[PDB]
Design an enzyme around this catalytic site. Structure first.
Site, PDB file in Angstrom:
ATOM      1  N   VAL B 103      -9.974   3.351  42.839  1.00 34.28           N
ATOM      2  CA  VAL B 103      -8.821   2.325  42.720  1.00 34.28           C
ATOM      3  C   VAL B 103      -7.605   2.853  43.153  1.00 34.28           C
ATOM      4  CG1 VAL B 103      -7.530   0.746  41.464  1.00 34.28           C
ATOM      5  CG2 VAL B 103     -10.184   0.948  40.981  1.00 34.28           C
ATOM      6  N   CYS B 104      -6.823   2.162  44.068  1.00 33.31           N
ATOM      7  CA  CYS B 104      -5.550   2.671  44.149  1.00 33.31           C
ATOM      8  C   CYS B 104      -5.453   4.141  45.070  1.00 33.31           C
ATOM      9  CB  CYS B 104      -4.648   2.841  43.152  1.00 33.31           C
ATOM     10  SG  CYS B 104      -2.530   2.982  43.350  1.00 33.31           S
TER      11      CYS B 104
END
Ligand SMILES: [Cl-]
Ligand SMILES: [Cl-]
Ligand SMILES: [Cl-]
Ligand SMILES: [Mg+2]
Lengths: 230, 230
Positions: B103-104
């Site tokens: 994520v991210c």
């Protein structure tokens, strides 16, 4: 430190639903000069309902006067609703707080503390019927404001709640900057976030999974309500 | 000890952006027959970039073989991108994991580990230009699937990512039930979650706030990329 720093406090209790705390925490901790406190009986580890371990930063006794108090929801709400130490702390902080707030089933704790009488409020969809016995007027909206009360709907509503609160404490441009930093342009892969849009079979599954908890929480709610009525 | 449980591990590192971990964690831990691990060099407290304290449950050495590895992003990824022990853990888990995920800015760690060469991936919008030097095919979408690789965009994209992963691990009906339990029908109070919809003034303010981090991370990225030659 600064003389004007905004003090934001979340209640952190065993069996909190951690996203009710951690979603708002990230929004609000991003704001200028804020200090965020995680409050329990004593500093130290507190286990959320998923098993994730969080850490309280202050005791009730040492918590400074809060500008914002926020009660997150979770399974642990039932015990809180009859926890005299926690309820007394909430009432004391609410006496002078600029904003008295909750996410999800945290509003049932505000209700048990007597702080929703005659006020519009929301909570998690699965427990929404428990607001009225506590004196609240239930509203089915994701973020509900009544004066300095702010209540959010179930779990992920904490993000929408916290961006709303950020704009109230500061301004729209500040909330927008935080929203962009969080890349909060949600695109859910399904349309089942509301009981009004989820497949009916999924709604039934959810209600069945919650029935025992709803039964126990209703008993607790009615005892809390009778205390308020007397 | 449910023997057939899906084993899901998140890397938990100093200066993680906590919501990249806690958002997906709450989604995935709600699934049936999963066990979720938080992994660092040793068990114990790990402080996120906002000051929220999390707790690693296992060391690299003690972690079981994972079905899902997930790298959350945060300020701390620059150090990870040159941390031989952390990269070795990621590579060994990814060598046989059923799903390799992030994520991210966690995808920049997958990139530094050599796991994005020729692969479609996304990351936080403010760092998206760092994917190509690591060999990735940069894709401007919130959740990107390429074989057994699944990457999410910035911070709150973790929730959409995790619901997508939940449907892959189980099925759509199960992911919908979790979405309903999380009441994930977002209603953001502003429309500034993407650089394409936010006011240009807000985009500029976010870019300026990220500028020192981006400068440091670009230098690290180009060193990590040169090491991918062999
Ligand atoms: Cl059915
Ligand atoms: Cl980052
Ligand atoms: Cl960095
Ligand atoms: Mg197995």
């Amino acid at each position: 430190g600064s003389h004007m720093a905004v003090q934001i406090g979340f209640l952190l209790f065993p069996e909190v639903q951690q996203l009710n705390l951690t979603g708002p925490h990230d929004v609000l901790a991003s704001l200028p000069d804020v200090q965020v406190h995680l409050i329990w009986k004593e500093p130290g580890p507190v286990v959320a309902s998923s098993g994730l371990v969080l850490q309280a930063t202050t005791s009730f006794a040492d918590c400074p006067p809060l500008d914002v108090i926020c009660i997150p929801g979770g399974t642990g709400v039932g015990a809180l609703m009859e926890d005299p130490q926690a309820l007394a702390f909430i009432r004391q902080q609410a006496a002078r707080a600029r904003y008295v707030t909750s996410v999800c089933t945290g509003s049932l704790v505000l209700g048990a503390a007597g702080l929703l009488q005659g006020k519009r409020a929301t909570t998690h969809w699965a427990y929404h019927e428990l607001l009225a016995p506590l004196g609240a007027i239930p509203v089915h909206e994701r973020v509900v404001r009544d004066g300095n009360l702010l209540t959010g709907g179930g779990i992920t509503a904490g993000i929408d709640f916290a961006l709303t609160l950020a704009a109230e404490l500061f301004d729209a441009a500040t909330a927008q900057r935080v929203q962009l930093q969080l890349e909060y342009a949600p695109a859910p892969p399904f349309n089942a976030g509301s009981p009004d849009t989820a497949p009916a079979s999924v709604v039934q599954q959810a209600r069945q999974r919650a029935a025992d908890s709803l039964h126990k929480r209703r008993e607790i709610t009615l005892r809390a309500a009778a205390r308020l009525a007397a």
